Amino acid sequence: VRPEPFADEALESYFLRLSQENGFERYRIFSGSVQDWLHTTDHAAAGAFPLELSRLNIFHASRSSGLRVRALQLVDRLTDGAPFRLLQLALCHSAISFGNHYKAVHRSGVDIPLSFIRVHQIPCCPDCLRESAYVRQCWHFKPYVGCHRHGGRLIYSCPACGESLNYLASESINHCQCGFDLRTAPDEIQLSALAYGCSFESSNPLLAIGSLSARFGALYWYQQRYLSDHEAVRDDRALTKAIGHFTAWPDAFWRELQQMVDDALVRQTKPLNHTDFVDVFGSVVADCRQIPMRNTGQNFILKNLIGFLTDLVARHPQCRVANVGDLLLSAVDAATLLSTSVEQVRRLHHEGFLPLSIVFHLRHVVELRQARMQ
Amino acid sequence: PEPFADEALESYFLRLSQENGFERYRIFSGSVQDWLHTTDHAAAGAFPLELSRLNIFHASRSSGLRVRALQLVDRLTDGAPFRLLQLALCHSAISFGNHYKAVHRSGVDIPLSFIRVHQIPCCPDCLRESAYVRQCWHFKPYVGCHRHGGRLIYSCPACGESLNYLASESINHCQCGFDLRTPDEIQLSALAYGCSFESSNPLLAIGSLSARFGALYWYQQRYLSDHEAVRDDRALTKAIGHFTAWPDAFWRELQQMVDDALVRQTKPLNHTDFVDVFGSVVADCRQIPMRNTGQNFILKNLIGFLTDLVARHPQCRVANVGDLLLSAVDAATLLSTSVEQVRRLHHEGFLPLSIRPASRNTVSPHRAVFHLRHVVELRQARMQSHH
Amino acid sequence: TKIEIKTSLGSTYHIPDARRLSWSGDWPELEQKQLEQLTSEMAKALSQPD
Amino acid sequence: AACINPQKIGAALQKIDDWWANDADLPLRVHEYGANHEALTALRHPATGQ
């Protein structure tokens, strides 16, 4: 009794369509029936299937998700004609959240940082809804401002009259509660709309990464460092700010880093060889851990920092007076710049590759990196 | 002398001594060991003369002192601090499964057993172009060559006298012999020196070299149980064909033993150990050194299978397959994480414990205690990543 | 399942069907209300003597 | 006649402890150590200071 499935839609949308095709008038009546059906075979599973649509998704459940998944499998099985798992339609907690880098949710190969998930209102697009009325998954991601098809400019949060749109809350696909048919009625916004499918043309900017999880990583880093939202809600600011930043980058990144360390010298009250690397560089190294890729060809932020640090030390060789390059790094920090582990750094100290300052100097790390790690 | 991109550490040193005219034993002892002694006493004490003994993975504890000797050479020969160290074979920090010794050379780790310690062969068709013993010969899984018309590496008995280059340090000729200017699958087996493949349909045809090495080690213990007969070429040559239908054969091997195990059942299944049915196939997944699923393809297929097995056997009044007990070290392997993390996961209540222990005691890592269906579900639910 | 409650202060409460009320969630109308009324009587029973 | 024991009714009523670990799940029966019988563990083990 299943409906046409699509590859680009949200789990909640599938369920609404599924119930309607069976002659159920309202979701609450349908879910009432299902929760009761389950009590004929597995009571723990039944206790894991809530009646209200807004909490149907897996990412919502803290320690009972185990039972919730089971419940979903029973639905697949009991409804006739079931060649396809519905488990491919929903968010799960992602494994990369360990260490609290940030929270993230997983879907079919891409990790999405949690902060990019919409919560209270849901935009939609009428030129797509007339063709096939179901809700697309990409509409739940904040970066997706503007539709990538049909011109797609200026997608609304309020269709008509006095009310914003939220289809989960009012349980409805084609109409809002005041009765407006949702289906009736700048140029660069597309540079973000394309996050949908990446699909970029060759270009000069750093954001020419083919890995989707890394593209999101990059956007998150930028938001976290510049679009701080101390002052504002960021509806689309990224479209006019991020594109430029990652286009003037051959210089823009060096200017920021070069100013930061010069600025540091001006305020360098204390003898420099007792100052931490972080005291001058502000943990930009730790932030390099936010991008999910570790190899140099994808993690361009770390790659450019090494460029800069190499020349910074190279202009400042060892002399009688503490100078740039005599800043201290931990084994964890050297391990990060050296693309290695902590125990391997300990071995490198133990085997004599580098000395201890009491803990390593920046010159020691850059020199050891250029000297032994190519 | 400049090093070659693919040169062994011992080859370079032999050439160096000879290039400076230090051809004889006594001057080899001298120009090497006595000079080192006169720099400092430690560079010599750590430095035995015989060539086989010179490399790190032959060494004991005082490696740093041997390195100092390499560093003295780096100064004498106008080098760079890691010019030689990029070539040396050292002790891996990675166990490569079951506490095996494994040896590390600039990014590739090769299990101790694949090092061709004795009887190094050679290929005259490349030696005539640049005469230096080259790397990728010291590997057991390597017979024949790429290029040169293929054929066989010319093997040890060149002329009624066994050959190698270490007990008798000449390159073109050895001992009594002359200047040595003397079946279509091995050229594929040959690709342990590099990968270079396209249209890689088999699961053995893609990846970094360390993985390609691990896959062979696994195949060997599992299907070449026959005692070593130094069929070094022929024994391994067959592994490639074997993997060509893997996506569809591995599962049948696993299915066969579910049924053969079942008919020998003596206890209700919910008190049966997972191991009694599957024979540690899980532990073997630890011989490939990588932890994540997208690279360790052997583990990836085993999990695929177990997920399906549970799916076709839902819970009912009589116990069935899927209720088997796992130990702490087994969940750690299936969940792609270290053991201490499982203890933390238990403590927060994300999974149940099925056997009640006695008081004033502890449950050890080897004790079987979680149900299979509980682990499979938890992993799908909260352990996925971009890997 | 139908649940009926009487108290010593003269109140009566009636849940026509107890099978649908969760730990977490908003209760249906007229039922949410009796939860508030019962909460008040008990809040007193717990806090004021005699 | 068949019956349910007093404390068995009582154990059900007082099961309203979900203040630990910032994860509500289902509530525990109030216990000085946060005992959880189903999982054979304890949520407010003295080792945590909770």
mmCIF file of C-alpha atoms in Angstrom, chain B residues 37-375:
data_model
loop_
_atom_site.group_PDB
_atom_site.id
_atom_site.type_symbol
_atom_site.label_atom_id
_atom_site.label_comp_id
_atom_site.label_asym_id
_atom_site.label_seq_id
_atom_site.Cartn_x
_atom_site.Cartn_y
_atom_site.Cartn_z
ATOM 1 C CA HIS B 37 85.064 6.005 17.702
ATOM 2 C CA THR B 38 87.280 9.056 17.347
ATOM 3 C CA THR B 39 84.264 11.325 16.946
ATOM 4 C CA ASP B 40 82.800 9.903 20.108
ATOM 5 C CA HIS B 41 82.933 6.491 21.790
ATOM 6 C CA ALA B 42 79.135 5.868 21.652
ATOM 7 C CA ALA B 43 78.849 6.026 17.854
ATOM 8 C CA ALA B 44 81.191 2.975 17.684
ATOM 9 C CA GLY B 45 79.961 0.966 20.691
ATOM 10 C CA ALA B 46 76.521 0.885 19.120
ATOM 11 C CA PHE B 47 78.000 -0.028 15.738
ATOM 12 C CA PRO B 48 78.876 -3.635 14.899
ATOM 13 C CA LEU B 49 80.596 -4.067 11.555
ATOM 14 C CA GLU B 50 78.832 -6.943 9.830
ATOM 15 C CA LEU B 51 76.376 -5.600 7.278
ATOM 16 C CA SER B 52 73.240 -7.552 8.199
ATOM 17 C CA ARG B 53 73.540 -6.303 11.787
ATOM 18 C CA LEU B 54 73.604 -2.595 10.858
ATOM 19 C CA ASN B 55 69.845 -1.966 10.390
ATOM 20 C CA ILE B 56 67.519 -0.846 13.174
ATOM 21 C CA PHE B 57 65.022 -3.703 13.170
ATOM 22 C CA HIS B 58 67.914 -6.032 13.912
ATOM 23 C CA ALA B 59 68.844 -3.886 16.873
ATOM 24 C CA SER B 60 68.099 -3.976 20.562
ATOM 25 C CA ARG B 61 67.517 -1.101 23.007
ATOM 26 C CA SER B 62 70.384 1.332 22.293
ATOM 27 C CA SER B 63 68.943 2.616 19.023
ATOM 28 C CA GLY B 64 69.481 6.300 19.779
ATOM 29 C CA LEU B 65 73.227 5.759 19.934
ATOM 30 C CA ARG B 66 73.141 4.012 16.558
ATOM 31 C CA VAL B 67 71.200 6.984 15.230
ATOM 32 C CA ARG B 68 73.871 9.318 16.500
ATOM 33 C CA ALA B 69 76.229 7.419 14.253
ATOM 34 C CA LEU B 70 73.909 8.039 11.330
ATOM 35 C CA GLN B 71 73.945 11.730 12.240
ATOM 36 C CA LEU B 72 77.751 11.861 12.153
ATOM 37 C CA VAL B 73 77.599 10.529 8.589
ATOM 38 C CA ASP B 74 74.978 13.162 7.736
ATOM 39 C CA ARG B 75 77.516 15.789 8.661
ATOM 40 C CA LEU B 76 80.528 14.129 7.004
ATOM 41 C CA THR B 77 78.668 13.555 3.747
ATOM 42 C CA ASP B 78 77.104 17.052 3.519
ATOM 43 C CA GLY B 79 73.578 15.872 4.265
ATOM 44 C CA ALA B 80 70.328 16.639 6.026
ATOM 45 C CA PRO B 81 69.230 15.299 9.393
ATOM 46 C CA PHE B 82 66.669 12.836 7.934
ATOM 47 C CA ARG B 83 68.288 11.964 4.620
ATOM 48 C CA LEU B 84 69.192 8.491 5.850
ATOM 49 C CA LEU B 85 66.454 8.100 8.385
ATOM 50 C CA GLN B 86 63.847 8.198 5.645
ATOM 51 C CA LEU B 87 65.427 4.967 4.402
ATOM 52 C CA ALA B 88 65.863 2.843 7.607
ATOM 53 C CA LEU B 89 63.541 0.014 8.819
ATOM 54 C CA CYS B 90 62.434 0.531 12.430
ATOM 55 C CA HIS B 91 60.148 -0.959 15.105
ATOM 56 C CA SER B 92 56.540 -0.121 14.423
ATOM 57 C CA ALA B 93 54.485 1.391 17.167
ATOM 58 C CA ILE B 94 51.617 -0.697 15.739
ATOM 59 C CA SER B 95 51.159 -4.364 16.803
ATOM 60 C CA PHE B 96 49.497 -5.451 13.495
ATOM 61 C CA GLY B 97 47.285 -7.910 15.416
ATOM 62 C CA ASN B 98 47.836 -10.574 18.109
ATOM 63 C CA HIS B 99 51.079 -8.801 19.366
ATOM 64 C CA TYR B 100 53.018 -9.626 16.104
ATOM 65 C CA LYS B 101 56.243 -7.787 15.477
ATOM 66 C CA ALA B 102 55.897 -5.407 12.515
ATOM 67 C CA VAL B 103 58.501 -3.214 10.807
ATOM 68 C CA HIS B 104 58.097 0.479 9.767
ATOM 69 C CA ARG B 105 59.707 2.280 6.785
ATOM 70 C CA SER B 106 58.547 5.874 6.106
ATOM 71 C CA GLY B 107 54.858 5.166 6.061
ATOM 72 C CA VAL B 108 54.524 1.507 5.192
ATOM 73 C CA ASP B 109 54.488 -1.179 7.843
ATOM 74 C CA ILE B 110 55.317 -4.723 6.837
ATOM 75 C CA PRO B 111 54.946 -7.697 9.208
ATOM 76 C CA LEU B 112 58.230 -9.275 10.373
ATOM 77 C CA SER B 113 57.483 -12.482 8.514
ATOM 78 C CA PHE B 114 57.546 -10.939 5.058
ATOM 79 C CA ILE B 115 61.106 -9.701 5.312
ATOM 80 C CA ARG B 116 63.269 -11.804 3.002
ATOM 81 C CA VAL B 117 66.157 -12.113 5.391
ATOM 82 C CA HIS B 118 68.222 -14.620 3.404
ATOM 83 C CA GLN B 119 69.003 -15.262 -0.276
ATOM 84 C CA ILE B 120 68.320 -11.836 -1.851
ATOM 85 C CA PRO B 121 67.744 -12.298 -5.594
ATOM 86 C CA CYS B 122 68.412 -9.775 -8.364
ATOM 87 C CA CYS B 123 67.216 -8.645 -11.809
ATOM 88 C CA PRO B 124 70.129 -8.282 -14.300
ATOM 89 C CA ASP B 125 67.923 -6.274 -16.659
ATOM 90 C CA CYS B 126 67.811 -3.434 -14.247
ATOM 91 C CA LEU B 127 71.222 -3.979 -12.674
ATOM 92 C CA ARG B 128 72.898 -3.207 -15.939
ATOM 93 C CA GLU B 129 71.323 0.262 -15.910
ATOM 94 C CA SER B 130 72.191 1.283 -12.378
ATOM 95 C CA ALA B 131 74.053 -1.145 -10.220
ATOM 96 C CA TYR B 132 72.952 -0.897 -6.607
ATOM 97 C CA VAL B 133 70.926 -3.411 -4.612
ATOM 98 C CA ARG B 134 67.462 -1.927 -4.675
ATOM 99 C CA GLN B 135 64.524 -2.024 -2.319
ATOM 100 C CA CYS B 136 61.417 -4.260 -2.888
ATOM 101 C CA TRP B 137 63.551 -7.370 -3.259
ATOM 102 C CA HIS B 138 63.711 -7.918 0.499
ATOM 103 C CA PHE B 139 60.029 -8.775 0.392
ATOM 104 C CA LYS B 140 58.838 -12.344 0.550
ATOM 105 C CA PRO B 141 55.681 -11.673 -1.413
ATOM 106 C CA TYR B 142 57.545 -10.518 -4.506
ATOM 107 C CA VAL B 143 58.650 -12.809 -7.283
ATOM 108 C CA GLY B 144 59.459 -11.579 -10.769
ATOM 109 C CA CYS B 145 59.233 -7.893 -11.638
ATOM 110 C CA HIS B 146 57.336 -5.168 -13.353
ATOM 111 C CA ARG B 147 58.891 -4.251 -16.772
ATOM 112 C CA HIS B 148 61.964 -5.914 -18.270
ATOM 113 C CA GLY B 149 59.919 -8.560 -20.095
ATOM 114 C CA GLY B 150 58.823 -9.792 -16.682
ATOM 115 C CA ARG B 151 60.027 -13.408 -16.006
ATOM 116 C CA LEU B 152 61.725 -14.356 -12.773
ATOM 117 C CA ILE B 153 64.092 -12.472 -10.531
ATOM 118 C CA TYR B 154 67.327 -14.366 -11.087
ATOM 119 C CA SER B 155 67.414 -16.474 -7.902
ATOM 120 C CA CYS B 156 70.296 -17.383 -5.449
ATOM 121 C CA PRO B 157 72.186 -20.280 -7.128
ATOM 122 C CA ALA B 158 73.685 -18.287 -9.945
ATOM 123 C CA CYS B 159 76.417 -20.821 -10.640
ATOM 124 C CA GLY B 160 76.674 -23.694 -8.173
ATOM 125 C CA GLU B 161 77.331 -21.345 -5.262
ATOM 126 C CA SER B 162 74.546 -19.721 -3.241
ATOM 127 C CA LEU B 163 74.429 -15.924 -3.594
ATOM 128 C CA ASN B 164 73.441 -12.812 -1.561
ATOM 129 C CA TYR B 165 75.004 -9.336 -1.063
ATOM 130 C CA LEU B 166 75.489 -9.297 2.679
ATOM 131 C CA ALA B 167 77.827 -12.107 3.680
ATOM 132 C CA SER B 168 79.795 -11.195 0.395
ATOM 133 C CA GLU B 169 79.470 -7.453 -0.460
ATOM 134 C CA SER B 170 79.723 -7.154 -4.207
ATOM 135 C CA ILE B 171 77.032 -6.017 -6.595
ATOM 136 C CA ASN B 172 77.802 -7.133 -10.170
ATOM 137 C CA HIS B 173 79.471 -10.442 -9.304
ATOM 138 C CA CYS B 174 79.847 -12.545 -6.194
ATOM 139 C CA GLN B 175 82.566 -14.873 -4.900
ATOM 140 C CA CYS B 176 83.487 -17.410 -7.587
ATOM 141 C CA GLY B 177 80.935 -16.064 -10.113
ATOM 142 C CA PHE B 178 80.748 -13.662 -13.010
ATOM 143 C CA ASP B 179 79.252 -10.288 -13.764
ATOM 144 C CA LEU B 180 75.645 -11.346 -13.819
ATOM 145 C CA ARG B 181 74.360 -10.443 -17.205
ATOM 146 C CA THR B 182 73.247 -14.003 -17.549
ATOM 147 C CA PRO B 183 53.022 -18.240 -15.903
ATOM 148 C CA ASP B 184 51.569 -14.746 -16.110
ATOM 149 C CA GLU B 185 50.229 -13.826 -12.664
ATOM 150 C CA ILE B 186 53.260 -12.843 -10.587
ATOM 151 C CA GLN B 187 53.540 -9.474 -12.333
ATOM 152 C CA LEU B 188 50.339 -8.634 -10.432
ATOM 153 C CA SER B 189 51.706 -10.079 -7.162
ATOM 154 C CA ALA B 190 54.736 -7.898 -7.818
ATOM 155 C CA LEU B 191 52.712 -4.784 -6.954
ATOM 156 C CA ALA B 192 53.809 -4.476 -3.314
ATOM 157 C CA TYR B 193 56.429 -1.913 -4.441
ATOM 158 C CA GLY B 194 53.587 0.361 -5.463
ATOM 159 C CA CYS B 195 49.926 0.057 -6.329
ATOM 160 C CA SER B 196 49.205 1.742 -9.663
ATOM 161 C CA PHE B 197 45.842 0.211 -10.385
ATOM 162 C CA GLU B 198 42.732 1.214 -12.432
ATOM 163 C CA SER B 199 39.377 -0.612 -12.947
ATOM 164 C CA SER B 200 39.967 -2.177 -9.578
ATOM 165 C CA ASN B 201 36.854 -4.345 -9.293
ATOM 166 C CA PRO B 202 38.236 -6.714 -6.614
ATOM 167 C CA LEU B 203 38.334 -5.622 -2.965
ATOM 168 C CA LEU B 204 42.068 -6.426 -2.966
ATOM 169 C CA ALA B 205 42.744 -4.013 -5.892
ATOM 170 C CA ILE B 206 42.519 -0.646 -4.059
ATOM 171 C CA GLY B 207 44.288 1.227 -1.277
ATOM 172 C CA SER B 208 47.503 2.168 0.502
ATOM 173 C CA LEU B 209 50.250 -0.449 0.737
ATOM 174 C CA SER B 210 49.867 -1.272 4.421
ATOM 175 C CA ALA B 211 46.349 -2.464 3.812
ATOM 176 C CA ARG B 212 47.456 -4.468 0.798
ATOM 177 C CA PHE B 213 49.990 -6.221 2.984
ATOM 178 C CA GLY B 214 47.550 -6.924 5.759
ATOM 179 C CA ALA B 215 45.036 -8.490 3.442
ATOM 180 C CA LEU B 216 47.614 -11.056 2.333
ATOM 181 C CA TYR B 217 48.728 -11.905 5.817
ATOM 182 C CA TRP B 218 45.074 -12.678 6.708
ATOM 183 C CA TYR B 219 44.499 -14.813 3.674
ATOM 184 C CA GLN B 220 47.556 -16.873 4.433
ATOM 185 C CA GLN B 221 46.845 -17.927 8.004
ATOM 186 C CA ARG B 222 43.266 -18.696 7.148
ATOM 187 C CA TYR B 223 43.644 -20.681 3.932
ATOM 188 C CA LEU B 224 47.289 -21.774 3.641
ATOM 189 C CA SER B 225 47.354 -23.805 6.843
ATOM 190 C CA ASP B 226 49.711 -26.261 5.270
ATOM 191 C CA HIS B 227 53.140 -26.001 6.896
ATOM 192 C CA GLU B 228 55.691 -23.758 5.223
ATOM 193 C CA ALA B 229 57.298 -25.304 2.185
ATOM 194 C CA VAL B 230 58.868 -22.057 1.032
ATOM 195 C CA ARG B 231 56.491 -21.967 -1.883
ATOM 196 C CA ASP B 232 56.913 -18.267 -1.447
ATOM 197 C CA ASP B 233 55.747 -17.520 -4.967
ATOM 198 C CA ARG B 234 53.117 -20.147 -5.549
ATOM 199 C CA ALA B 235 51.525 -20.111 -2.145
ATOM 200 C CA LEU B 236 50.486 -16.502 -2.340
ATOM 201 C CA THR B 237 49.991 -16.218 -6.048
ATOM 202 C CA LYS B 238 46.441 -17.575 -5.735
ATOM 203 C CA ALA B 239 45.150 -14.941 -3.317
ATOM 204 C CA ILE B 240 44.064 -12.549 -6.034
ATOM 205 C CA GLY B 241 41.653 -14.930 -7.771
ATOM 206 C CA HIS B 242 40.202 -15.830 -4.420
ATOM 207 C CA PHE B 243 39.045 -12.295 -3.734
ATOM 208 C CA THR B 244 37.330 -11.800 -7.136
ATOM 209 C CA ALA B 245 33.994 -13.043 -6.050
ATOM 210 C CA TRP B 246 34.450 -11.913 -2.445
ATOM 211 C CA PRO B 247 31.492 -9.701 -2.173
ATOM 212 C CA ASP B 248 29.439 -12.887 -2.687
ATOM 213 C CA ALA B 249 31.465 -15.714 -1.191
ATOM 214 C CA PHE B 250 32.406 -14.507 2.240
ATOM 215 C CA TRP B 251 28.930 -14.596 3.345
ATOM 216 C CA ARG B 252 28.471 -18.192 2.419
ATOM 217 C CA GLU B 253 31.509 -19.173 4.358
ATOM 218 C CA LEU B 254 29.928 -17.521 7.366
ATOM 219 C CA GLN B 255 26.470 -19.017 6.711
ATOM 220 C CA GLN B 256 27.840 -22.541 6.424
ATOM 221 C CA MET B 257 29.039 -22.541 9.983
ATOM 222 C CA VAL B 258 25.822 -21.147 11.427
ATOM 223 C CA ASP B 259 24.070 -24.298 10.282
ATOM 224 C CA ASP B 260 26.814 -26.727 11.216
ATOM 225 C CA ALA B 261 26.994 -25.133 14.600
ATOM 226 C CA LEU B 262 23.294 -25.194 15.119
ATOM 227 C CA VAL B 263 22.852 -28.957 14.740
ATOM 228 C CA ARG B 264 25.509 -29.524 17.421
ATOM 229 C CA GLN B 265 23.731 -27.309 19.945
ATOM 230 C CA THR B 266 23.727 -28.395 23.612
ATOM 231 C CA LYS B 267 22.436 -25.369 25.610
ATOM 232 C CA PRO B 268 19.632 -22.930 25.015
ATOM 233 C CA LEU B 269 21.170 -20.231 22.807
ATOM 234 C CA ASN B 270 20.793 -17.331 25.198
ATOM 235 C CA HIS B 271 23.509 -18.783 27.471
ATOM 236 C CA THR B 272 25.812 -19.756 24.507
ATOM 237 C CA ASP B 273 29.074 -17.793 23.874
ATOM 238 C CA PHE B 274 29.363 -15.936 20.583
ATOM 239 C CA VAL B 275 32.711 -17.603 20.028
ATOM 240 C CA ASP B 276 31.284 -21.141 20.039
ATOM 241 C CA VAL B 277 29.598 -20.486 16.763
ATOM 242 C CA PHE B 278 31.905 -18.199 14.836
ATOM 243 C CA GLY B 279 35.336 -19.293 15.922
ATOM 244 C CA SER B 280 36.997 -15.924 16.508
ATOM 245 C CA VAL B 281 36.480 -14.645 12.992
ATOM 246 C CA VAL B 282 36.013 -11.291 14.757
ATOM 247 C CA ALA B 283 39.422 -11.220 16.374
ATOM 248 C CA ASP B 284 41.087 -11.829 13.028
ATOM 249 C CA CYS B 285 39.799 -8.455 11.875
ATOM 250 C CA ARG B 286 42.509 -6.954 14.048
ATOM 251 C CA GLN B 287 45.344 -8.145 11.847
ATOM 252 C CA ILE B 288 44.776 -5.287 9.376
ATOM 253 C CA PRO B 289 46.148 -2.350 11.355
ATOM 254 C CA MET B 290 43.487 0.272 10.499
ATOM 255 C CA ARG B 291 40.505 0.889 12.787
ATOM 256 C CA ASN B 292 37.829 2.552 10.659
ATOM 257 C CA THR B 293 35.346 0.736 8.432
ATOM 258 C CA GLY B 294 35.922 2.547 5.163
ATOM 259 C CA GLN B 295 39.492 1.316 4.864
ATOM 260 C CA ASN B 296 39.499 -2.052 6.652
ATOM 261 C CA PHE B 297 37.315 -3.822 4.149
ATOM 262 C CA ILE B 298 37.388 -7.234 5.890
ATOM 263 C CA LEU B 299 35.607 -5.799 8.920
ATOM 264 C CA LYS B 300 33.202 -3.919 6.728
ATOM 265 C CA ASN B 301 31.867 -7.152 5.215
ATOM 266 C CA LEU B 302 31.628 -8.975 8.493
ATOM 267 C CA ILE B 303 29.482 -6.285 9.935
ATOM 268 C CA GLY B 304 27.313 -6.221 6.904
ATOM 269 C CA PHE B 305 26.566 -9.830 7.360
ATOM 270 C CA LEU B 306 25.805 -9.669 11.080
ATOM 271 C CA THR B 307 23.392 -6.842 10.596
ATOM 272 C CA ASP B 308 21.407 -8.900 8.146
ATOM 273 C CA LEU B 309 21.503 -11.941 10.346
ATOM 274 C CA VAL B 310 19.850 -10.120 13.213
ATOM 275 C CA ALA B 311 17.312 -8.491 10.919
ATOM 276 C CA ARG B 312 15.851 -11.791 9.780
ATOM 277 C CA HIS B 313 15.598 -13.150 13.358
ATOM 278 C CA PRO B 314 13.383 -10.907 15.587
ATOM 279 C CA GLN B 315 12.660 -11.645 19.268
ATOM 280 C CA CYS B 316 10.012 -14.208 20.323
ATOM 281 C CA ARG B 317 9.291 -16.715 23.163
ATOM 282 C CA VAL B 318 11.999 -19.240 22.365
ATOM 283 C CA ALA B 319 15.524 -17.967 22.106
ATOM 284 C CA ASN B 320 17.308 -17.892 18.683
ATOM 285 C CA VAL B 321 20.640 -16.741 16.880
ATOM 286 C CA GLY B 322 21.237 -13.166 17.678
ATOM 287 C CA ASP B 323 20.952 -13.625 21.397
ATOM 288 C CA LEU B 324 24.537 -14.848 21.676
ATOM 289 C CA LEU B 325 26.818 -13.318 24.233
ATOM 290 C CA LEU B 326 29.766 -11.003 23.354
ATOM 291 C CA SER B 327 32.650 -10.089 25.660
ATOM 292 C CA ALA B 328 33.882 -6.575 26.322
ATOM 293 C CA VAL B 329 36.791 -6.897 23.842
ATOM 294 C CA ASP B 330 34.370 -7.995 21.160
ATOM 295 C CA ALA B 331 32.085 -5.074 21.341
ATOM 296 C CA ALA B 332 35.146 -2.858 21.192
ATOM 297 C CA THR B 333 36.053 -4.393 17.862
ATOM 298 C CA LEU B 334 32.585 -4.212 16.308
ATOM 299 C CA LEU B 335 32.019 -0.683 17.565
ATOM 300 C CA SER B 336 35.383 0.549 16.220
ATOM 301 C CA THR B 337 36.540 1.889 19.545
ATOM 302 C CA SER B 338 38.837 1.090 22.479
ATOM 303 C CA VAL B 339 37.690 -0.969 25.458
ATOM 304 C CA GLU B 340 37.672 1.722 28.049
ATOM 305 C CA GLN B 341 35.107 3.500 25.928
ATOM 306 C CA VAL B 342 32.762 0.531 26.253
ATOM 307 C CA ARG B 343 33.054 0.643 30.001
ATOM 308 C CA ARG B 344 32.154 4.307 29.892
ATOM 309 C CA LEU B 345 29.230 3.522 27.585
ATOM 310 C CA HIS B 346 27.953 0.899 30.033
ATOM 311 C CA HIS B 347 28.253 3.218 32.946
ATOM 312 C CA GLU B 348 26.010 5.765 31.345
ATOM 313 C CA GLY B 349 23.329 3.266 30.670
ATOM 314 C CA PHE B 350 23.335 3.018 26.984
ATOM 315 C CA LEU B 351 23.416 -0.711 27.118
ATOM 316 C CA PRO B 352 22.368 -3.528 29.499
ATOM 317 C CA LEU B 353 24.427 -6.249 31.200
ATOM 318 C CA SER B 354 22.951 -9.755 31.042
ATOM 319 C CA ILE B 355 24.828 -11.924 33.520
ATOM 320 C CA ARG B 356 24.718 -11.230 37.226
ATOM 321 C CA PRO B 357 28.230 -11.496 38.709
ATOM 322 C CA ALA B 358 29.048 -12.299 42.323
ATOM 323 C CA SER B 359 29.799 -9.637 44.900
ATOM 324 C CA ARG B 360 33.308 -8.444 45.734
ATOM 325 C CA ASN B 361 34.369 -9.353 42.227
ATOM 326 C CA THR B 362 34.815 -7.824 38.832
ATOM 327 C CA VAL B 363 33.912 -8.821 35.329
ATOM 328 C CA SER B 364 37.022 -9.239 33.223
ATOM 329 C CA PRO B 365 37.309 -8.207 29.542
ATOM 330 C CA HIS B 366 37.304 -11.824 28.447
ATOM 331 C CA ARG B 367 33.921 -12.703 30.081
ATOM 332 C CA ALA B 368 30.977 -13.021 27.672
ATOM 333 C CA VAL B 369 28.163 -10.626 28.653
ATOM 334 C CA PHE B 370 26.217 -8.462 26.051
ATOM 335 C CA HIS B 371 23.641 -9.766 23.581
ATOM 336 C CA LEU B 372 24.410 -9.577 19.903
ATOM 337 C CA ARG B 373 21.218 -7.849 18.892
ATOM 338 C CA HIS B 374 21.844 -5.084 21.443
ATOM 339 C CA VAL B 375 25.265 -4.226 19.996
#
